[PDB]
């Protein structure tokens, strides 16, 4: 039931200020209650728990979705001679694999991360505290993680993103080299395994075609550039 | 040609959201009348990439956990055809080096146990169990370092009866591989929490008998006591409802795995 609370766009990346306006304060909290002074810390605790986390997010993700486009890719692509639809296809692909794969990454360190920076902050701020005010400060504590964890991972995932489309295009570039080297003796670029499996083996009605890929094939593709997860999918605005 | 021309539409009808719905549940139901499926998905325009789209497109539905009965149904149609990729001689070395395994890992790490979950877990696992059941040793090294270990125990210690036994043959399969031996005894810590979980399983068991489970938790215990520090650690910490008539009963129809167990017992001496 529940949809994605933010677009792409909605969130500056460029830096952690871009975290500050759509951080939530649920005023019904009772550590807020009786400390309302309290609620001047959480931006920082927020703001800290991303940053310690995320390069180590984006590199792992990065990471895992790496392979698994460029394979596929490479595969679905291999009788293309031209590398513009492939790299687009790729760029799509990638960058959808890279924030899905962040989403997972990151859910619950930042749980335990901002949950740990809000009760140390908690603590310090006030006081001294007490075995009914800490339980107030651990309540707190949670329930502000929870509050704030999409918003986080959003900020996470498309540091991702934005960083996966560049790597995705250095890992093809053998791909690339391939065809346009192809081009320069005159000739289209085809994969001569692939091309012998497709014409001896595979039944003509899914058979890859030499004269290549007709534009609604390519709706997977496209699918991955319109709906990225943890982001409200792109339309006619 | 007419059922098979079927085939090909539906293969073709993947690609577009439109129609990938119904081509998921069309073609999950004739996986085992069409023997060259695999194939045709692996090798076909953009289909492994619509079956990755429909894993990825749950994981916002993975944290918190809100997954419903459809959304699993759907998805494990598109699971049960990567098993099916995942099995075939001709696609299995292929999927493993696109590292499709990784993105089921997910999966494997919930711990929700509502039906649509416990569907997803049990159907994710089928797909690992098709890799490893074909004993191709440059599957077990792909595990080995992708830390899938740890998502079957704690599988086999909380799952239900169906899961449990899924992963423990997993961990099975992995452990009669040489590497796969030697990779669990390393360490004790490592041994250690294996031989733990076993015995919970074991003493689970005894309350509630379930063939199949047995069968594999004695094997796993037989062929650690292969490895000789796990074979003096199971001098000691081996259960004690293995050494007793406590599934005498259960096993006198079983006689492979009685003679495994018998085996075992003769081990650890
Ligand atoms: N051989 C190590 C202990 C050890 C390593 N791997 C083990 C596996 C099981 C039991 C003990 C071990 C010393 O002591």
Partial sequence: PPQPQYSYHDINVYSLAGLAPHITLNPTI??????????????????????????????????????????????????????????????????????????ITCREPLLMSISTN??????????????????????????????????????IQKTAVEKAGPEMDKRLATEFELRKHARQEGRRYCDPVVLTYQAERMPEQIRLKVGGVDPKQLAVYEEFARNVPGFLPTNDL | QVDREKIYQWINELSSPET???????????????????????????????????????????????????????????????????????????????????????????????????????????????????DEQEVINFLLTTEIIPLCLRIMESGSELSKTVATFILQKILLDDTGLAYICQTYERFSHVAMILGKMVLQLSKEPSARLLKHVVRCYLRLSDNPRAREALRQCLPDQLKDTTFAQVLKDDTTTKRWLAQLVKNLQ
């Fill in chain 1, 30 to 103: 009772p550590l807020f209650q009786a400390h309302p002074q309290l609620k001047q810390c959480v931006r920082q605790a927020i703001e800290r728990a991303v940053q310690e986390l995320v390069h180590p997010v984006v590199d792992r993700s990065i990471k895992i979705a790496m392979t698994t486009c460029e394979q596929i890719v490479r595969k679905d692509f291999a009788l293309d001679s031209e590398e513009s639809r492939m790299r687009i296809a790729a760029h799509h692909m990638m960058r959808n694999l890279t924030a899905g794969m962040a989403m």
């Fill in chain 2, 20 to 134: 990938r719905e119904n081509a998921l549940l069309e073609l999950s139901k004739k996986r085992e009348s069409v023997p060259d499926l695999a194939p045709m998905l692996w090798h076909s325009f953009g289909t492994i990439a619509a079956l990755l789209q429909e894993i990825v497109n749950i994981y916002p539905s993975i944290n918190p956990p809100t997954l419903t009965a459809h959304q699993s149904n759907r998805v494990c149609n598109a699971l049960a055809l990567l098993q099916c990729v995942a099995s075939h001689p001709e696609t299995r070395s292929a999927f493993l080096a696109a590292h499709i395994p990784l993105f089921l890992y997910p999966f494997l790490h919930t711990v929700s146990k509502t039906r649509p979950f416990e569907y997803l877990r049990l159907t994710s696992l089928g797909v690992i169990g098709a890799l490893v059941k074909t």
């Fill in chain 1, 118 to 155: 809000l009760k140390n902050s908690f603590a310090s701020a006030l006081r001294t505290a007490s075995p009914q005010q800490r339980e107030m400060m651990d309540q707190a504590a949670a329930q502000l993680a929870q509050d704030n964890c999409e918003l986080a991972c959003c900020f």
